[PDB]
Structure formats: C-alpha cells, structure tokens
Ligand binder design. Structure first.
Ligand SMILES: O=C(O)[C@@H]1CC[C@H](Oc2ccccc2)C[C@@H]1COc1cccc(Cl)c1
Length: 134
C-alpha cells in the first residue's frame, strides 16, 4: 500500500461551485466556459510504481496526465492551455501547480469522507468541485 491509495479509482463529478468565475480568472473565453461548465467529468486515478495517472473523460474533452511527484511535465488542459505542471503530496493533499504565459493556478485534491474534493485557485478566486465514487 502506498502514497495515493485513497485517491485511486473512478470518480464522477457531483457538484461544482464558482467554476465560471474561476475559468474567467484563468482567461477562458465565453464559448469554452459555457460548454466546459456543463460537463460532468469522470476522473480515473491509478498508480503504477512511481507513476500516477489522472484521466478525465467528458462530453467536452478527454484529458490524461501521467507524472512522478515533484517532477515537472508538460500538460494540455481541457481549455487547451499549454502549461508546465508540477504535482506534489503535501500532508496527504495532491498539490498541482500549472504555469503558463507568466500566470499560475493551483489545484488541490483531497479525500474528505467518501468524496474527492478538488479546489481550484487563481489569484483570489476559488472553485470547489466535488467527486463521488462512480
Ligand atoms: O477535476 C476538475 O474538475 C478540474 C477542473 C479544472 C481543471 O480543468 C479546467 C477545465 C476547464 C477550464 C479550466 C480548467 C482540471 C480538472 C478538470 O479537468 C477536466 C478535463 C476534461 C474535461 C473537463 Cl470538463 C475537465
């Protein structure tokens, strides 16, 4: 057993708060905000050795990232940003920092009861996205 055991599995989005304002802060345009904001993604998290994989599947876009903790990688986000990402574990929370165009956003993922809670922060704006097991 290991580092991210409690994150592994298949998860479905059940609630979202303040996501449009977060996307606006990130710089997402109108049409993408509308379509992306409708989506109810499934997130599939797996671990193989040191490599963590997070897949998301939705009506809007499918994305996939594989990474080693602390080791920067290139990511294409669902809104088509080309970012440089670093993901670490801080006290049981996955902390994902994305850098692009001189900007930065942080996504934190934690287990809370039977949920996986995703908090997305850009400057002073937070969005909270809650997932349940699928
Ligand atoms: O897990 C979440 O809900 C985070 C939400 C913010 C980030 O994504 C963003 C998505 C759109 C705009 C800005 C940022 C990462 C993940 C969600 O990734 C996906 C992947 C494919 C399709 C969809 Cl619709 C969302």
């Amino acid at each position: 057993s290991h580092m991210c055991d409690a994150f592994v599995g298949t998860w479905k989005l059940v609630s979202s708060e303040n996501f449009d304002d977060y996307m606006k802060e990130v710089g997402v345009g109108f049409a993408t905000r509308k379509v992306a904001g409708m989506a109810k993604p499934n997130m599939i998290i797996s671990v193989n050795g040191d490599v963590i994989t997070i897949k998301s599947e939705s009506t809007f876009k499918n994305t996939e990232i594989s990474f080693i903790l602390g080791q920067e990688f290139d990511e294409v986000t669902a809104d088509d940003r080309k970012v440089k990402s670093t993901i670490t574990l801080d006290g049981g929370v996955l902390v994902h920092v994305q850098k692009w165009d001189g900007k930065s956003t942080t996504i934190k993922r934690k287990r809370e009861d039977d949920k996986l809670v995703v908090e997305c922060v850009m400057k002073g704006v937070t969005s909270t996205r809650v997932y349940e097991r699928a």
